[PDB]
Design a protein around this motif. Structure first.
Motif, PDB file in Angstrom:
ATOM      1  N   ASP A 153      44.034  23.801 -19.388  1.00 52.50           N
ATOM      2  CA  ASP A 153      42.769  23.256 -19.181  1.00 52.50           C
ATOM      3  C   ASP A 153      41.817  23.834 -20.056  1.00 52.50           C
ATOM      4  OD1 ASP A 153      43.417  21.062 -17.720  1.00 52.50           O
ATOM      5  OD2 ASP A 153      43.507  22.492 -16.095  1.00 52.50           O
ATOM      6  N   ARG A 204      32.516  16.118 -17.147  1.00 50.62           N
ATOM      7  CA  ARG A 204      32.966  17.524 -17.748  1.00 50.62           C
ATOM      8  C   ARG A 204      31.836  18.672 -17.633  1.00 50.62           C
ATOM      9  NH1 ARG A 204      37.668  15.830 -22.063  1.00 50.62           N
ATOM     10  NH2 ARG A 204      39.173  14.804 -20.710  1.00 50.62           N
ATOM     11  N   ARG A 205      31.820  19.569 -17.671  1.00 52.00           N
ATOM     12  CA  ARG A 205      30.978  20.604 -17.678  1.00 52.00           C
ATOM     13  C   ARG A 205      31.602  21.830 -18.684  1.00 52.00           C
ATOM     14  NH1 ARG A 205      26.082  18.507 -16.485  1.00 52.00           N
ATOM     15  NH2 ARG A 205      24.339  20.307 -16.263  1.00 52.00           N
ATOM     16  N   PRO A 206      31.381  21.727 -20.008  1.00 49.83           N
ATOM     17  CA  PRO A 206      31.983  22.809 -20.808  1.00 49.83           C
ATOM     18  C   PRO A 206      31.114  24.213 -20.829  1.00 49.83           C
ATOM     19  CG  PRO A 206      30.747  21.328 -22.163  1.00 49.83           C
ATOM     20  CD  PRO A 206      30.849  20.756 -20.743  1.00 49.83           C
ATOM     21  N   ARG A 207      31.689  25.280 -20.876  1.00 50.08           N
ATOM     22  CA  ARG A 207      31.274  26.614 -20.725  1.00 50.08           C
ATOM     23  C   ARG A 207      30.919  27.182 -22.168  1.00 50.08           C
ATOM     24  NH1 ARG A 207      28.454  27.245 -16.474  1.00 50.08           N
ATOM     25  NH2 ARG A 207      27.694  25.497 -17.637  1.00 50.08           N
ATOM     26  N   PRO A 213      25.156  25.398 -21.094  1.00 52.56           N
ATOM     27  CA  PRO A 213      26.517  26.391 -21.297  1.00 52.56           C
ATOM     28  C   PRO A 213      26.110  27.599 -20.804  1.00 52.56           C
ATOM     29  CG  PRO A 213      25.729  26.251 -23.492  1.00 52.56           C
ATOM     30  CD  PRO A 213      24.447  25.498 -22.535  1.00 52.56           C
ATOM     31  N   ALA A 266      37.539  30.101 -16.020  1.00 47.11           N
ATOM     32  CA  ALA A 266      37.464  28.663 -16.773  1.00 47.11           C
ATOM     33  C   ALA A 266      38.297  28.837 -18.160  1.00 47.11           C
ATOM     34  CB  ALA A 266      35.901  28.332 -17.197  1.00 47.11           C
ATOM     35  N   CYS A 294      30.249  14.115 -22.813  1.00 46.57           N
ATOM     36  CA  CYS A 294      30.892  14.971 -21.831  1.00 46.57           C
ATOM     37  C   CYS A 294      30.124  15.037 -20.689  1.00 46.57           C
ATOM     38  CB  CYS A 294      30.782  16.482 -22.342  1.00 46.57           C
ATOM     39  SG  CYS A 294      31.705  16.375 -23.909  1.00 46.57           S
ATOM     40  N   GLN A 329      39.222  21.623 -22.393  1.00 53.97           N
ATOM     41  CA  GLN A 329      38.109  20.944 -21.663  1.00 53.97           C
ATOM     42  C   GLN A 329      36.854  21.635 -21.451  1.00 53.97           C
ATOM     43  OE1 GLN A 329      39.692  19.008 -17.985  1.00 53.97           O
ATOM     44  NE2 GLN A 329      41.467  18.359 -18.995  1.00 53.97           N
ATOM     45  N   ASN A 330      37.108  22.831 -21.961  1.00 52.40           N
ATOM     46  CA  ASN A 330      35.769  23.895 -21.552  1.00 52.40           C
ATOM     47  C   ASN A 330      34.888  24.150 -22.823  1.00 52.40           C
ATOM     48  OD1 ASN A 330      37.929  24.913 -19.145  1.00 52.40           O
ATOM     49  ND2 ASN A 330      35.784  24.133 -18.426  1.00 52.40           N
TER      50      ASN A 330
END
Lengths: 807, 807
Positions: free
Chosen positions: A242, A191-194, A338, A237, A186, A245-246
């Motif tokens: 989408d 990508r920057r998951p929260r 995160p 987000a 990731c 993707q988070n």
């Protein structure tokens, strides 16, 4: 100077006696002549050479393992030689194999080993300056074995869709995961998951994991489906199209030995595990754990769920669950950075709205440092003939409503295991996590027994640290709509063990909190009103704990006085006992006392004696006796209450004592469950109190946890040093166990003797007319406070949404 | 078909990501080109070769150990290669050493290893047919380091006087010791000793061993000094000037890890141990134990003792004492074939006449199958201020006199540990030893818990088997003059542990004997009078065991009734209690009951809870309370007895109850000890009964205890099979422990509840005037029987010597 004894057959014959004169030192010429007079060895040598002609996979893997063991021992020349031998062996062997995957993997491993050998040689020469040199990191991506062509998703890159990635890690202290150069897919892809979720697993069947994954996919689908432009809808987000993707899901197993094989088969089916890759690529590293990365796609019946980004980390050796949380939090949270962090177990089946409600609360409030959802039993009404399940259902409902509402009104929650709990990754980054993992960083000898005992159930430490963090004002909150359905044991023994661990953790966490409550005023920075409210809650907490400590004695006194002394001294109102032979009147009391004492003695002996699995019949018998006694007492009490013409005091006491449950249940709309399970819960109160408390207190003992060449004298010194170290370690372990056992015994003796002495003094120096009103007042006060807390929580939850515009 | 990814730095760099496509199988030409494009490896290879130029001792020893491990695994080619490598390494290394002893030993070991390699190669070729080939036996004799020139003895050959012999053995089942080709120095030289002594050792200081050896030398000197021509003098192999050649002493240690280092230093001083020889010569064998042989000469002060033929066997891994007896009996007894066999422990200091009296009894009687000597405490009068030592001294004296005389009159003795016991090696060779070692040959799962529990104290099994052997009439005997002085613990805790093991063994051995008593009549061949006498003794044994089972309840009843109900209901004769406030009268009884119950509860909780070493203060406190209570009861009873004007019944009961001890003690001439220690023993009776029985019953849980090459799929199958086997083994261990714990818990519950119910029923449904006479009658009957037995034994021992001429 004398010639050697004429013995040329030492191992050839069955038995030979010889004399070796020391101090002569021998002549070299005679020994050389003896050596030159032997020719058979050549044949053996030739045979050995022939046998050594062909290598094998097993030999190469064993040599690489020995090389890794030598490298861990800080001896470098032997490690270099073994690494070179293993690399050449694998390079030669790779051509023999007919399976293409094996050939490719062996070739790659051989090249990597040779490059590492060259680098290590350069370091040994002194060309390169490094500390603790290790083989370079090399993650391998391979196609997934089984791929579903008939699957429809939003959009997936072929590299992401059809390739699974693997790497073994060596990091001994998880805080150094990022420094050593490891990376995640990731983060690599940008990508920057929260949001992150951790799913701890240990010895579980595939069905629970499958259900958990399906429920998470349903939650993601519900989050995506929500429309924009509404006040209720989330913004940012977590919008639609989408959302997948988070969110990242981490599955942390506890040990290769204990993992159920069918679980591994299922994991391999969905493309998250491969035995050949683990066997080949992990030979030389000596990895602490191995991590696989994928973006899995699931299909249930004719409906295809949403893709889930998954990282599966499998540890080499068994450790505690706290170790899994250590790895997860430190490594992955510090790397990804995160915003939120959710913790759950395997088998927790969420509803379609849990994530939405949790995120909604976190975004709306901006003061919440942590939250916990409601816990429920799956299929409570089905199979209602079982009493343990119904009792647990009633206990969960009442505990949630009353205790959670009362504690969440003030902004301080003692979360019960094992809930689905979410913390925002800003109030726990520093000191709270340091105090969380204090057991893993310091050996138990320095801490002591009291500190070590409380970390068996470790969530409450995090809760208290978050509430009382320095220079910050963080409060916790309880969300009613985040429903999580679990599965409960169907028999007594599993319930007994589960309650044992729960009670140990809860008791020592409560003691720690009472000890350290002053840190809120001394260090934290809250509002004055908050400090006053916390003081009031502290007083209530002290009173509740003190009342709960003396519960068995109070139960015995109440039952004895009311039922049996009413029968003996003619105080039952629906029948008069002035008649009878004066033998039955005393016989009732004698039977009651003897049965109670014998039952308690048997229970304590069994609980302190053996594991509660081969003593099923005795526990069942004692539980049945106590249940029949409690049902008889309940019927007699109901008759006595109904016979009385009644008074204002009587009706007020009856309401504030018993009807608070029904009133609070009806207020929140959950009333039928109480009606269904009240009878089942009533018959297990003595069992609960006596058996669970005794077994919890009895089993408190459950603690957890470089010279390359040489001469002869060095060998002797090495052996002596190793023996000394081993003996010292054994002595230290003995001392630790002795201290822990002594502490637990002292606590148990104090508890039991306090209860017994209180009961005896109250029986001998008090009457049934000067004691019962005090008990009624105490119980009424506690239940009134709990009811007020529940009403306040309901009013807040139904009012703040409309009234928050002003403040 | 695609070229490999352009990654030539896998372990060189810190972190590299790669993709390996499976199913392509690669082109050979591209891989060959990639291999040929690398030149750095050569440097590393050169360095490795240089490092490989010189060998070392540690490498050779490690390779030999790995070869032994492979040979134990049934893989022969790898074992041959490793053996050849190790032999060549040792042969090369031997020249470097400067110490002559090391050089000679290394040269000999290298030659032996090469010869074994040649023989193994010949066997692998199929030339020689054998099963389980092993390296040939090779015992090494070396000069003793320190030799006392100023020592005078009868006569000693220089080879025997100045050379110590060593050999390591591999025999896994000790019955095959003679078949595999091992031998002893005594058998090799032609000597045929007739008497053997075994001295088991485990974690002992040098002083005890030194004292034991000095005492044995004194016994040999006394045996030699006796003159011929007398009726008392022995005739035959035990005459003078050659007695030291007919006795062999075996010292069996329990494990190298647990042996005290100073003990090893002392053993090396007297020429019976050498670390270098053990380190070098035991490399390849993988020995189960190592045996040293010598004829040691000892000097104390200015007097030189007699030489002693000694064999010291040191086991590699820790095992039970029964394992040591297994090795000793089977191997050494079956090889030497002695006539007698004596067993003792380390620290047992014999007097100058013990051996003479034992041999005299064995030779005179010709029906004795076993004998035991008297046990005594060393220095009893010294430090008389200690109460535990005096109590133990009194217990030993009374037990010996009364019980041993009574049991030896009928010809059946239950020997108490740990006595100096002698058996003739003709009545124990067959079935009795098979039943002795039944635990070591069959796993505990088949036997069950009851069978396994009784072998904790294993002597009584041998005694009963000897008495009831089929087609033979063997009887045991007790010798009063064979005095053995031991050392006893000075505190309560060691006494508690010792009594725990003693009581467990005694109880279960007694149960086994009562169960199997019928074998004497069904199978044995005795005289009719002997069978009738054994029936009478069986009745007495049943009555005594039944009385001893209910002892705590009887003690409580006696104390309560006599003292406290005499005070309450005015039955004390030296004072009248018709006065007083009626509050003190009930207060006495209430205090007594509450104190007794609280003490029992605390004792049982502590005993079942933790090890009795960190609970010293509580045990001391309880013991002090019980001792004060017993002393008060004794004073009150003495006053009551003296106040009464007395009657024939009173004086007869008093005599037959209390004065039997003094009468029997005066009859045998040992009366002053009773006078000195009676008071000290009186104050420990409740402590003895309650504490020792409870701790013994609570801790009953203490149970004891090939493919050379390969492909990938074979590796996977091997790993899976190993995991399955490990899990099954763990499950089996769990099941065994569960069964044993359940059995012990059931027994403890039965005992405690039987005692409690009996006490309650007797208190509530009986009076102090209808119960005490029964107790007096029972105690008087038992003591009368014991006194008659003692008198009969004394009459026999003083009459048979003169009256045996007629019969």
């Amino acid at each position: 100077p004398l010639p050697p004894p004429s013995i040329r057959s030492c191992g050839s014959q069955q038995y030979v006696t010889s004399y070796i004169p020391t101090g002569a030192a021998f002549p070299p010429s005679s020994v050389q002549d003896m050596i030159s007079s032997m020719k058979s060895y050549a044949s053996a040598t030739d045979l050995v050479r022939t046998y050594s002609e062909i290598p094998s996979v097993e030999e190469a893997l064993s040599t690489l393992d020995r090389a890794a063991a030598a490298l861990n021992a800080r001896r470098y020349r032997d490690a270099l030689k073994l690494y070179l031998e293993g690399g050449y062996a694998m390079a030669n062997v790779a051509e023999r194999q007919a399976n293409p995957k094996i050939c490719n993997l062996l070739t790659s491993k051989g090249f990597e080993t040779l490059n590492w050998c060259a680098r290590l040689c350069d370091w040994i020469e002194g060309r390169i300056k490094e500390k603790h040199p290790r083989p370079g990191v090399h993650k391998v991506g391979i196609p997934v074995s089984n791929w579903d062509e008939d699957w429809v998703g939003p959009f997936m890159d072929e590299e992401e869709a059809r390739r699974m990635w693997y790497t073994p890690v060596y990091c001994p202290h998880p805080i150094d995961f990022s420094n050593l150069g490891y990376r995640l897919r990731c983060v690599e892809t940008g990508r920057r998951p929260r949001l992150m979720i951790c799913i701890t697993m240990y010895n579980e069947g595939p069905q629970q994991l499958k259900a958990t994954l399906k429920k998470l996919a349903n939650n993601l689908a519900y989050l995506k489906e929500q429309m924009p432009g509404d006040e209720k809808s989330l913004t940012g987000a977590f919008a639609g199209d989408d959302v997948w993707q988070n969110v990242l899901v981490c599955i942390v197993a506890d040990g290769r030995e204990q993992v159920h094989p069918k679980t591994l088969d299922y994991l391999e089916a969905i493309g998250l595990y491969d035995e050949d890759l683990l066997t080949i690529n992990s030979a030389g590293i000596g990895a602490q754990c191995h991590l696989f990365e994928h973006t899995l796609q699931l299909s249930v019946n004719g409906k295809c769920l949403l893709p889930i980004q998954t990282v599966f980390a499998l540890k080499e050796n068994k450790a505690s669950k706290l170790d899994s949380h250590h790895w997860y939090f430190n490594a992955f949270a510090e790397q990804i950075q995160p915003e939120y962090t959710a913790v759950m177990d395997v088998g927790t089946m969420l509803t379609k709205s849990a994530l939405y409600h949790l995120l909604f609360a976190f975004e709306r409030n901006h003061q919440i440092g942590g939250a916990c959802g409601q816990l429920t039993v799956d299929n409570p009404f089905e199979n209602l003939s079982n009493w343990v399940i119904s009792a647990q259902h009633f206990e969960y409902k009442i505990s949630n409503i009353l205790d959670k509402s009362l504690e969440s009104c003030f902004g301080f929650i003692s979360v019960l295991p094992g809930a689905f709990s979410a913390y925002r990754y800003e109030a726990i980054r520093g000191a709270p996590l340091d105090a969380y993992f204090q057991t893993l960083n310091i050996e138990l000898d320095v801490l002591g027994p009291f500190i070590g005992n409380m970390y068996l159930a470790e969530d409450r430490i995090l809760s208290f640290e978050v509430v009382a963090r320095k220079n910050c004002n963080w409060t916790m909150h309880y969300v009613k709509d985040a429903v999580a359905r679990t599965d409960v044991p169907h028999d007594l023994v599993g319930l007994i063990s589960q309650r044992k661990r729960w009670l140990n953790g809860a008791f020592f966490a409560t003691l720690f909190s009472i000890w350290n409550w002053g840190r809120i005023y001394s260090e934290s920075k809250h509002t004055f009103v908050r400090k006053m409210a916390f003081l009031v809650f502290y007083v209530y907490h002290l009173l509740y704990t003190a009342f709960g400590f003396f519960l068995p004695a109070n139960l015995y006194l109440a039952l004895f006085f009311i039922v049996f002394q009413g029968f003996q001294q003619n105080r039952l109102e629906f029948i008069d006992t002035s008649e009878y032979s004066q033998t039955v009147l005393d016989c009732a009391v004698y039977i009651y006392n003897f049965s109670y004492l014998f039952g308690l003695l048997m229970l304590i002996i069994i609980g302190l004696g053996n594991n509660p699995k081969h003593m099923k019949l005795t526990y069942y018998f004692v539980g049945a006796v106590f249940g029949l006694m409690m049902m008889l007492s309940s019927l007699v009490g109901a008759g006595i209450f109904f016979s009385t013409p009644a008074t204002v005091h009587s009706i007020v006491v009856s309401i504030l004592t018993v009807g608070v449950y029904f009133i609070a249940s009806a207020l929140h709309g959950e009333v039928h469950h109480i009606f269904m399970t009240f009878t089942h819960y009533t018959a297990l109160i003595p069992s609960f109190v006596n058996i669970f408390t005794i077994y919890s207190f009895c089993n408190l003992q459950d603690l957890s946890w470089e010279t390359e060449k040489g001469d002869f004298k060095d060998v002797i010194a090495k052996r002596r040093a190793l023996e000394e170290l081993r003996r010292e370690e054994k002595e230290r372990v003995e001392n630790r166990k002795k201290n822990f056992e002594a502490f637990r015994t002292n606590v148990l003796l104090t508890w039991a003797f306090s209860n017994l002495i209180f009961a005896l003094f109250v029986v001998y120096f008090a009457s049934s007319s000067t004691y019962m009103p005090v008990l009624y007042i105490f119980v009424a006060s506690l239940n009134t406070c709990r009811l007020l807390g529940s009403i306040g929580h309901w009013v807040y939850i139904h009012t703040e949404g409309l009234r928050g515009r002003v403040i």
